[PDB]
């Protein structure tokens with residue numbers, strides 16, 4: 001298991017935006033409570049799950065636990081960095097797991113909900 005992605009930036013000032021408020025209070029909150037969220041709420045523990053090839057295939061690990069902490073810690077300078085992390089999390093799932101696997105159906109359900117919410121992302125302001 002690699003160290004988890006950094007979730008706090010000591011060199012970054014605290015700044016709210018409409019889009020980051022939306023990404024935490026609407027997007028993350030809605031995905032987090034979903035019945036299929038749980039496999040995505042923490043980094044893949046390749047040791048506990050005995051997946052010796054996972055971190056060989058996945059160069060950029062990402063999960064909603066990391067995204068949640070990043071939003072709570074105001075880690076993201078803008079909405080697009082956060083959207084990129086969600087996209088990476090889904091991509092990792094689709095490139096590692098066989099199509100139609102339970103985890104892929106769970107990712108597809110969450111991604112459908114994610115894109116539903118991102119389509120209603122507030123304007124930059």
Ligand SMILES: CCOC(=O)CNC(=O)CN(Cc1ccc2nc(-c3cc(C)c(=O)n(C)c3)n(CC3CCOCC3)c2c1)C(=O)c1c(F)c(F)c(N=[N+]=N)c(F)c1F
Pocket residue numbers: 038039040044048049051092093096097102103
């Ligand atoms: C401390 C105790 O020690 C242990 O027993 C260690 N092993 C366990 O606990 C393992 N678990 C729980 C668990 C936790 C997080 C996981 N995250 C993933 C996962 C994998 C992959 C490649 C991936 O790409 N991503 C993004 C996530 N998986 C794999 C599963 C993902 C969903 O479809 C089925 C494989 C996870 C597994 C399960 O076996 C367990 C379980 F899988 C259940 F579905 C379940 N539901 N019910 N009822 C349940 F009760 C389970 F306990």
